[PDB]
A paper describes a structure:
MTMRs are part of a large group of tyrosine/dual-specificity phosphatase superfamily (PTP/DUSP) members in eukaryotes. Typically, the active MTMRs catalyze the dephosphorylation of phosphatidylinositol 3-monophosphate (PI(3)P) and/or phosphatidylinositol 3,5-bisphosphate (PI(3,5)P2) to produce PI and PI(5)P, respectively. Most MTMRs possess Pleckstrin homology (PH)-GRAM and coiled-coil (CC) domains in addition to the phosphatase (PTP) domain, and some MTMRs contain extra domains, such as differentially expressed in normal and neoplastic cells (DENN), PH, and FYVE domains. In this study, we determined the crystal structure of the PH-GRAM and active PTP domains of human [name] and investigated its substrate specificity through enzymatic and mutagenesis assays.
The [name] structure was determined by molecular replacement using the MTMR2 structure as the search model and refined to 2.07 Å resolution. The refined model included four [name] molecules (A, B, C, and D chains), 652 water molecules, and 6 phosphate ions in the asymmetric unit. The refined [name] monomer structure was composed of 14 β-strands (β1−β14) and 17 α-helices (α1−α17) that formed two individual domains: the PH-GRAM domain (residues 98–205) and the PTP domain (residues 226–605). The PH-GRAM domain, which was originally implicated in protein or lipid binding during membrane-associated processes, exhibited a β-sandwich structure formed by seven β-strands (β1−β7) and one α-helix (α1) that was similar to the MTMR2 structure. In the [name] and MTMR2 structures, the PH-GRAM domain bound tightly to the large and shallow cleft of the PTP domain formed by residues in and around three helices (α6, α13 and α17) and a loop located between α11 and α12. Among them, one phosphate molecule (D3 phosphate site of PI) was positioned in the deep cleft of the active site pocket and was mainly trapped by its interaction with the main chains of the six residues (Ser(Cys)438, Ser439, Gly441, Trp442, Asp443, and Arg444) from the C(X)5R motif. The side chains of Asp440 and Asp443 are positioned away from the active site cavity because of the formation of hydrogen bonds with the side chains of Lys285 and Arg484, respectively, creating sufficient space for the phosphate ion or D3 portion of the substrate. The molecular packing of [name] in the crystal did not show any oligomeric association.
Numbering used by the authors: 98 to 139, 144 to 160, 171 to 186, 194 to 605
């Protein structure tokens, strides 16, 4: 079997039967490495990263995968080896990323530089400064080391605001309009609780964010959640900004459902796409998953944010509960609509590095890297669902993005594979602790060393206006190239 630099064979068993869903059963040799399982017949090639493996179960072995397929095998050896190497963090080993020894002409770790990105946006300026208050992750330990905040806020006041926001995730700048100065700041829910606690500093801080947009007379807060779910959160000590505490602000709910319904949705969708589609009942089954309605809700949400910035010329604040699953989906979809830089390949890479990775989407937890707890309720395809949305925009706007569909699918494949450092861990701090930036390779090193493979030939770089995709089921499609890829 073929091997990456740093990859080692763990087992090679001959005469093993792979069971196609339809085309019977092939004979071949099964190699297990610490990176992948490999199966060859002599041509028939099955090449499957152990990262995509969710659970292994004797039936006679069933391999449940995370990329819309299963595998059936007919035979330490096999079971124990797949288990040991598919789930190394459950077995005192490291993820493969840390052994990968390839060297690329381009270093992906240099693609995103926070200070450069802020500078690309016109920052700092008179109203927004680069703050180092979190340079040791002591201020908010799930936030990146660098944040952008209003010039006028004192560090002591920011700390009070942090005590009033879940996990200390205070409002910080995500994007600023280069003409109006309207901004998208992001945060987590305020800790109001059932007795309507108030924090003068929080109220005052939201007010300074508004005053930084000097022409504007109000501030909009998009709360990603359903009204009912925000109310539940309120009884638990969370909640949202009130009309009376935040006088110059107005809050609206985007009604996006919680991470568990998204997991359940994708689960139902896998049932009907693999091993085969029953086309006689395809229409209702797919409808029954509600997968495309949740896509629509998100795109509709992001358009509202985009429209308010671009047309309304009004600064907005996006928050959810912890401000790192739906918040990250919404700010980055709206930024993508607003700023054509992010529709280039390097721009989209900074967008994922910044809004997703540097701000703490819990990738390790949400995806389950190298951990065997398949039933964990903290796993959810939040990032996948986001990439689907992005794919929706490339399809309504087939010349607007520099990257192509294979770019997006390649990202999803390496979301699971752990070949690269890029989607490792749950927050920036964890990444410095675990030596990710020194012991692992960036996904973008690979992608950007082979740009032609991932480029949209139809791309036109002056399609640089705000894009408002149409959030209607009539204008959306099932991403069959990804979801039905395996048959």
């Amino acid at each position: 079997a073929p091997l990456f630099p740093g990859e080692s064979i763990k087992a090679i068993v001959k005469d093993v039967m792979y069971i196609c869903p339809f085309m019977g059963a092939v004979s071949g040799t099964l190699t297990v490495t610490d990176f992948k399982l490999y199966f060859k017949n002599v041509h028939f090639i099955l090449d499957v990263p152990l990262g995509v493996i969710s659970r292994v179960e004797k039936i006679g072995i069933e391999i449940v995968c995370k990329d819309m397929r299963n595998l059936r095998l007919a035979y330490l050896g096999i079971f124990e080896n797949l288990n040991k190497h598919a789930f190394p963090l459950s077995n005192g080993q490291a993820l493969f990323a840390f052994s990968y020894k390839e060297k690329f002409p381009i270093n992906g770790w240099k693609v995103y530089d926070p200070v450069s990105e802020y500078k690309r946006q016109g920052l700092p300026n008179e109203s927004w400064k680069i703050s180092k208050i979190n340079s040791n992750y002591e201020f908010c330990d799930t936030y990146p080391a660098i944040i952008v905040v209003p010039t006028s806020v004192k560090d002591d006041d920011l700390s009070k605001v942090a005590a009033f926001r879940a996990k200390g995730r205070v409002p910080v700048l995500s994007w600023i309009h280069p003409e109006s100065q309207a901004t998208i700041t992001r945060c987590s829910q305020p800790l109001v609780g059932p007795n309507d606690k108030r924090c003068k500093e929080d109220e005052k801080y939201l007010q300074t964010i508004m005053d930084a947009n000097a022409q504007s007379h109000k501030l909009i807060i998009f709360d990603a959640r359903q009204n009912s779910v925000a109310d539940t959160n309120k009884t638990k000590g969370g909640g949202y900004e009130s009309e009376s505490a935040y006088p110059n602000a107005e809050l609206v709910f985007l009604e996006i459902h919680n991470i568990h319904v998204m997991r359940e949705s994708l689960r139902k969708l896998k049932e009907i796409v693999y091993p085969s589609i029953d086309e006689a009942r395809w229409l209702s089954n797919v409808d029954g998953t509600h997968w495309l309605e949740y896509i629509r809700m998100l795109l509709a949400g992001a358009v509202r944010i985009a429209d308010k910035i671009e047309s309304g010329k009004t600064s907005v604040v996006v928050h959810s509960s912890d401000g790192w699953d739906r918040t990250a989906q919404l700010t980055s979809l709206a930024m993508l609509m607003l700023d054509s830089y992010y529709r280039t390949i390097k721009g989209f890479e900074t967008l994922v590095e910044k809004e997703w990775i540097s701000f703490g989407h819990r990738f390790a937890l949400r995806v389950g890297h190298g951990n065997d707890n398949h039933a964990d309720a903290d796993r959810s395809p939040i990032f996948l669902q986001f990439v689907d949305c992005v794919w929706q925009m490339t399809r309504q706007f087939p010349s607007a993005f520099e990257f192509n569909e294979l770019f997006l699918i390649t990202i999803l494949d390496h979301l699971y594979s752990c070949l690269f450092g890029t989607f490792l861990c749950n927050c920036e701090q964890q990444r410095f602790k675990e030596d990710v930036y020194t012991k692992t390779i960036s996904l973008w090193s690979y992608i950007n060393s082979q740009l032609d493979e991932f480029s949209n030939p139809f791309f036109v770089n002056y399609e640089n206006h705000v894009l408002y995709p149409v959030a209607s089921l009539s204008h959306l499609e099932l991403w069959v190239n990804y979801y039905v890829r395996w048959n």
